[PDB]
């Protein structure tokens, strides 16, 4: 734990988050959206009160970022206010209030988190608006767990770690022998030409845009428990079977190409002790996959985990470090290692985690994001798209190949896969 | 040479004079036409004369201010050409103006005596000695042309902009009136529309631009002020020849495309007050071919009109330049030590000659500040505009706006015409409106006003204008219109513009 420094050193991914904001103070590209729907009994001056006192018991509400001279630098501010709007409105009128809501945040200003509460004639609806350097996945969950205990009048055990002690861990980790292992795996690895994947779009506009649209795949929970049970047969995760269908289905699109690139996101979470601060920990991967279309899904599912674990095991090397090692540097119109993110997040911890929607407003990190989510026993199987490169009908003729690509693969464990058919029948009849 | 070659003599025969002998020699010619009404030169003159007299008899003598409140009626032209051939010079006003103006306008002029419409004879309060315009008491019976003691150096009107009048010589508006009459010629088969409210320069021509070629006057009523297919139907009604229009009114106007048609007779459309768009004027010809459009610029203390632009149907401008002076006029840029600017190069617009008017009245403060006498003009002084503009190569003057609202934010002084451009590129976007704004001192941020009735979220719209440009010019804040705001003169003013909101 750091003593009570004035300032204190960002982490790597800090400085990255910051200098992305920066260089667009007006986006709400990492605003970090949900709502959870309460019933008309709750009391929402409990709910505000509930919040005001996270805001007072986590640093991360209570961070500032601030440039001095060319050191990212992060200030801690002993009491911030909270922002709480209360308004009154009908479920026509829900994505109105909410859209008024998203406003930029000022990294320099705490707290970096916005709420409120629309009530209508059903429901009494919590809204919370947060920054990802601040809220990344399992904070989110972290979150919902506390303030479920507080709502249920429970108490909670203090804070032993801050974050700024994991700041200063992971700057001096940064100069041990043990990184300089893992950044020349790295280079090794990156070191020669990279494959590029070429998706089926419009014409690209010059610069990066950013305005996308989601679509949501429900695999049922029958469908969802025989895939678990294939992958607990053959000692494998969902999360890797998930994987290989996607690059399976990246390769297919790609003319059937022997390798793929596509970014994955690791929890971040390198010391134990940070399992409960609030704080983006999570790390951004390159995933470098080789399909072998001669042979079967299975051994395609072994390959994808002979690949997959040195990517694991160096995964606590930062993005920009990554970029640096392979002599890569963010230009063009294209992202800089891989244009398709794939997201994985396990089952709610909680009852009132599960009732948290996701909610995007209009905004794609990247040209395609694949985030399957385990809900209600099911798959919420998400296709974050660019809307400059795809449109809706586009987008659903991909999810529809996909779909029918990930049922030919869960009844062909065995077959070939090169035998599973990408283009669906009603597309043949239409061409026809 | 190429600019300022302008010199071209003119009759300095006064303009009433040429009333005179028009209904001398062709009394019987229609000269006045509101809707029924088709007054011919010997019916128009000779109720000229009569009210001519009752001023004379009550103490007008030149350089007299004769106050005027007559909307847009047969009364209007009769108490302007009488208070002319009165002597005295007679000055606007608008009757749906608050009281504390006219009391203001009137304390701060000084005037003699007040000509009003019958309704308008109460909302001049406190006036000394007012001749209802209407009533036939304020008429002499006596229609002898009165003597023109009237010389080319006294008042012919006053024209208000604490608003300052503009007073101007009678010479002035001569060297206009023949000066528009060369490059657009009014003759007898030819007609002009009344379009623009007196209370502004732009009226003084059309209300005396027929006079040099015995054409006739369409006194368009006042309930088609506004009302683009009301005007529209003038034009072929009448066959107007002439119209005056502004940048505001005409985009309207062209919204009615080449569908309608029959409008045989019309010549020229001459837009004046604003800068004009560029697709306004391609978007003008498909409508109307066989037609010239003109681009005028003048200020209120340069008689009327001070330049002109004669665009070519075969030509599309990248910035639509206010053009060339007008005979007998000179225009200079200058910068703020006071010393010509060349080619390209911003400053000051200044006109001089002949045509420069008196000044502004009961305001000496004010006038030796805007008309400094200049070495440029061999002593004689220019009148300060206070417009940004600049030279093109072939002589041509751009209009570029108003001082100190260009800023150099981030480094760029560059203007906002091509933000403007790339907006109208879209078809959900209809116009475009770049204005930047300071809420507090030290926080300015700039806003952008279109129309496109389509939703378009605040995070599509930010990524909208990178398809366009980088990211180092966005407009910080975006406004969702339904149909743009304007103020009461039919023109854009930054002070209609509001606070942004989605």
């Given at each position: 734990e750091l003593d009570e420094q004035a300032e204190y050193e960002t982490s790597a991914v800090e400085k990255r988050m910051y200098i992305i904001q920066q260089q667009d103070?007006?986006?709400?590209?990492?605003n970090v959206v949900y709502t959870i729907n309460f019933p008309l009994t709750v009391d929402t001056e409990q709910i505000r009160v509930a919040l005001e006192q996270l805001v007072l018991r986590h640093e991360g509400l209570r961070s500032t970022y601030h440039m001095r001279g060319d050191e990212i630098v992060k200030r801690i501010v002993p009491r911030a206010e909270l922002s709480f709007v209360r308004q009154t409105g009908e479920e026509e009128s829900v994505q109105s209030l909410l859209a008024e809501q998203i406003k930029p945040f000022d990294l320099a200003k705490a707290p970096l988190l916005r709420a409120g509460v629309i009530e209508t004639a059903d429901k009494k609806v919590l809204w919370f608006d947060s920054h990802h350097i601040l809220l990344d996945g399992l904070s989110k969950s972290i979150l919902a767990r506390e303030l479920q205990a507080l709502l249920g009048q429970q108490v909670l055990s203090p804070?032993?770690?801050?974050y700024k002690s994991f700041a200063r861990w992971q700057n001096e980790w940064f100069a041990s022998d043990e990184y300089e292992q893992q950044i020349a795996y790295w280079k090794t690895l990156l070191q020669g030409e990279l494959p590029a994947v070429q998706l089926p779009t419009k014409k690209r506009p010059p610069q990066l845009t950013f305005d996308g649209a989601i679509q949501m795949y429900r695999v049922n929970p029958e469908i969802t428990r025989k895939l678990k049970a294939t992958a607990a047969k053959h000692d494998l995760t969902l999360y890797m079977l998930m994987l290989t269908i996607v690059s399976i289905w990246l390769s297919k699109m790609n003319s059937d190409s022997n390798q793929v690139i596509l970014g994955t996101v690791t929890d971040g979470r390198q010391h134990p002790d940070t399992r409960e601060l609030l704080g983006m920990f999570v790390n951004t991967l390159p995933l470098l996959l080789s399909i072998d279309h001669e042979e079967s899904f299975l051994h395609n599912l072994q390959q994808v985990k002979a690949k997959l674990l040195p990517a694991l095991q160096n995964q606590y090397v930062p993005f920009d470090k990554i970029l640096e090692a392979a002599r890569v540097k963010r230009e063009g119109n294209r992202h800089p290692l891989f244009d398709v993110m794939f997201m994985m997040q396990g089952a709610p911890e909680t009852e009132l985690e599960s009732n948290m929607h996701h909610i995007n407003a209009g905004i794609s990190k990247f040209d395609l994001t694949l985030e399957v989510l385990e809900r209600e026993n099911g798959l919420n199987i998400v296709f974050e798209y660019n809307t400059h490169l795809f449109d809706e009908g586009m987008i659903l003729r991909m999810v529809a190949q996909f779909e029918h690509l990930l049922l030919q693969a869960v009844h062909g464990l065995d077959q070939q896969v090169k035998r599973f058919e990408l283009v669906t029948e009603d597309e043949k009849r239409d061409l026809f | 040479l190429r600019v300022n070659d302008t010199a071209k003599a003119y009759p300095n025969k006064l303009i009433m004079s040429m009333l005179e002998d028009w209904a001398a020699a062709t009394p019987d010619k229609t000269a006045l036409v509101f809707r029924e009404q088709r007054v011919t030169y010997r019916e128009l003159n000779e109720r000229v004369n009569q009210l001519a007299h009752t001023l004379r008899e009550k103490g007008v003598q030149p350089d007299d201010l004769v106050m005027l409140m007559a909307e847009r009626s047969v009364e209007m032209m009769v108490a302007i050409f009488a208070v002319l051939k009165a002597g005295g010079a007679y000055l606007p006003i608008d009757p749906h103006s608050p009281a504390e103006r006219i009391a203001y306008i009137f304390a701060d002029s000084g005037a003699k005596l007040v000509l009003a419409q019958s309704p308008f004879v109460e909302k001049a309060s406190m006036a000394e000695v007012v001749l209802d315009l209407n009533s036939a008491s304020s008429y002499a019976a006596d229609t002898s042309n009165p003597p023109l003691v009237n010389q080319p150096g006294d008042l012919v009107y006053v024209m208000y902009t604490k608003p300052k009048g503009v007073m101007i010589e009678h010479g002035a508006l001569l060297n206009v009136l023949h000066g528009m009459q060369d490059e657009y010629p009014l003759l007898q088969d030819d007609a002009f529309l009344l379009k623009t409210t007196y209370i502004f320069d732009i009226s003084v021509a059309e209300i005396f631009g027929w006079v040099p070629g015995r054409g006739k006057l369409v006194i368009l009523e006042p309930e088609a002020e506004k009302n683009p297919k009301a005007i529209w139907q003038a034009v072929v009604g009448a066959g107007i020849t002439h119209i005056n229009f502004v940048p505001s009114m005409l985009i309207p106007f062209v919204e009615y495309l080449e569908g309608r048609t029959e409008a045989n007779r019309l010549r020229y459309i001459l837009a004046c007050g604003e800068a004009m768009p560029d697709e306004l004027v391609p978007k003008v010809y498909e409508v109307l071919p066989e037609v010239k459009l003109e681009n005028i610029y003048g200020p209120?203390?340069?008689?009327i009109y001070a330049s002109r632009y004669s665009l070519a149907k075969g030509s599309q401008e990248s910035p639509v330049p206010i053009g060339k002076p007008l005979p007998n006029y000179r225009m200079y840029i200058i910068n703020r030590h006071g010393q010509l600017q060349p080619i390209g190069v911003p400053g000051e617009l200044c006109i001089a000659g002949a045509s420069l008017a008196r000044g502004y009245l009961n305001n000496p403060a004010l006038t030796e500040e805007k008309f400094t006498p200049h070495p440029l003009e061999k002593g004689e002084r220019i009148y300060r505009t206070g417009d940004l503009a600049r030279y093109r190569e072939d002589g041509n003057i751009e209009y570029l706006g108003r001082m100190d609202h260009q800023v150099k934010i981030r480094g760029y002084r560059i203007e906002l015409d091509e933000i403007r451009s790339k907006l109208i590129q879209e078809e959900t976007i209809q116009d475009a409106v770049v204005v930047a704004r300071n809420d507090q001192n030290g926080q300015a941020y700039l806003c952008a006003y279109l129309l496109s009735e389509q939703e378009w979220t605040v995070g599509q719209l930010r990524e909208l204008l990178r398809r366009e440009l980088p990211?180092?010019?966005?407009?910080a804040h975006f406004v969702l219109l339904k149909q743009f705001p304007l103020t009461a003169n039919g023109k854009l003013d930054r002070k209609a513009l509001p606070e942004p909101d989605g």
């Open positions: 103070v007006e986006s709400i590209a990492y804070v032993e770690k801050t | 209120t203390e340069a008689t990211e180092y010019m966005i407009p």
